[PDB]
Amino acid sequence: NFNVAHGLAWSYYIGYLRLILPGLRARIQAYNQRHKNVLGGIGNHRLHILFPLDCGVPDDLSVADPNIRFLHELPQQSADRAGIKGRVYTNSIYELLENGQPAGVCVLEYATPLQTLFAMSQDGRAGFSREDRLEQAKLFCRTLEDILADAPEAQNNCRLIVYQEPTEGGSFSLSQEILRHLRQEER
Amino acid sequence: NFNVAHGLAWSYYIGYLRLILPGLRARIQAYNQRHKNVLGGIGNHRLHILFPLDCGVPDDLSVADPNIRFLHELPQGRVYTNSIYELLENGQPAGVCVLEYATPLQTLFAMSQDAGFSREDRLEQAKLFCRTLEDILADAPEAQNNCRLIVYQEPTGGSFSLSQEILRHLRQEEREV
Numbered sequence: 001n002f003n004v005a006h007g008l009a010w011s012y013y014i015g016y017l018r019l020i021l022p023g024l025r026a027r028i029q030a031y032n033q034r035h036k037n038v039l040g041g042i043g044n045h046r047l048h049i050l051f052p053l054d055c056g057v058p059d060d061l062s063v064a065d066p067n068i069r070f071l072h073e074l075p076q077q078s079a080d081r082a083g084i085k086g087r088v089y090t091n092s093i094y095e096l097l098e099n100g101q102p103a104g105v106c107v108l109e110y111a112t113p114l115q116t117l118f119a120m121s122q123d124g125r126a127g128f129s130r131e132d133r134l135e136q137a138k139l140f141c142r143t144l145e146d147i148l149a150d151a152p153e154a155q156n157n158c159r160l161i162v163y164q165e166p167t168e169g170g171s172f173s174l175s176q177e178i179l180r181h182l183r184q185e186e187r
Numbered sequence: 188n189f190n191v192a193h194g195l196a197w198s199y200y201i202g203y204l205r206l207i208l209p210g211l212r213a214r215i216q217a218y219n220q221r222h223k224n225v226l227g228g229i230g231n232h233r234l235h236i237l238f239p240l241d242c243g244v245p246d247d248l249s250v251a252d253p254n255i256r257f258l259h260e261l262p263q264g265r266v267y268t269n270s271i272y273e274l275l276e277n278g279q280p281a282g283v284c285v286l287e288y289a290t291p292l293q294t295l296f297a298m299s300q301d302a303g304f305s306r307e308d309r310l311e312q313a314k315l316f317c318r319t320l321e322d323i324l325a326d327a328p329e330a331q332n333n334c335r336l337i338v339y340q341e342p343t344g345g346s347f348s349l350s351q352e353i354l355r356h357l358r359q360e361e362r363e364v
């Protein structure tokens with residue numbers, strides 16, 4: 001039984017989003033304070049989560065797209081978690097380039113449960129192919145969104161950036177996709 | 188839909204157990220080399236995962252039992268650290284091991300506190316989570332030999348001694364070595 005998406009959504013919400021999002025805005029503030037009249041401030045205070053519905057996450061997106069560039073990590077959030085003293089949650093600020101110059105800066109990351117789905121389709125078991133990985137990833141996204149619609153505070157502290165990928169041409173820039181979202185929160 | 192246990196089991200094995208267990212021996216013996224002549228070695232090389240079925244998972248193990256005292260961190264993108272604890276019995280140290288809870292049970296717990304999820308629903312997801320993960324471990328001798336579930340049903344305050352439950356499993360593991 002590989003019907004796993006509902007689990008992934010509730011696990012992501014309770015085990016990460018609802019634990020890390022109430023502290024995010026203060027760790028962005030803290031970082032702005034440490035480098036205020038040097039680095040320049042992060043204005044957008046929401047966590048940007050990439051959701052590639054093919055479940056293709058690279059281990060270093062900075063080296064993936066040359067228009068996405070690691071800036072700094074936020075101040076760490078260390079916490080005792082279920083017997084693990086000092087479990088560490090870290091988050092990263094990235095810069096986005098457009099047509100040469102910089103154009104965006106935000107706290108950004110991939111939705112980690114999509115890696116789970118990815119490993120599941122590669123593990124050699126019988127009834128879980130990319131087809132199923134695809135429908136699981138969309139059910140995951142759907143359920144997580146349903147969950148956030150009933151959590152206004154968490155919904156106001158992050159932004160979900162969902163996209164498929166054309167596996168052919170330059171039909172898609174991920175920086176372009178992120179920049180459009182940042183210019184929608186514009187509003 | 189609250190059939191969550193299946194996603195919890197696959198999540199916990201694929202995104203954690205599968206990724207930390209292979210290099211657990213090496214972190215232990217690096218610790219043993221660092222701390223041999225002073226703090227002392229860690230004999231038992233396996234991760235011990237507490238699995239309370241009532242989903243009572245405090246973040247500090249000493250709060251669940253004063254006889255479980257933190258000894259030292261097991262050190263070492265995304266970072267994975269663990270905690271070595273020592274078990275007191277009759278006021279004296281009786282066992283040492285890398286020990287932690289199965290964090291996803293906290294997901295089950297918070298779901299019951301809400302929506303559409305009751306305490307019995309929770310207990311049955313906890314039991315389904317347990318069976319599926321144990322099904323997965325039986326299929327992965329690699330991972331199966333380097334961890335141990337410690338499954339129990341008491342609210343971890345009482346005349347139930349969680350430290351005794353752990354010391355029991357620790358001795359049984361020494362027996363089949």
Ligand SMILES: Nc1nc2c(ncn2[C@@H]2O[C@H]3COP(=O)(O)O[C@@H]4[C@@H](O)[C@H](n5cnc6c(N)ncnc65)O[C@H]4COP(=O)(O)O[C@@H]3[C@H]2O)c(=O)[nH]1
Nearest residue numbers: 011012015016089112113116198199202203266267290291
């Ligand atoms: N980006 C990011 N995501 C995280 C982090 N911690 C958790 N998550 C996400 O939320 C997890 C569910 O939280 P939980 O701690 O209850 O999970 C359980 C947790 O008990 C265990 N685990 C994973 N990493 C660690 C860890 N570093 N330390 C201790 N336990 C860990 O295995 C986790 C499932 O891993 P996963 O597939 O990455 O699952 C999502 C994972 O997508 C994190 O630090 N960074």
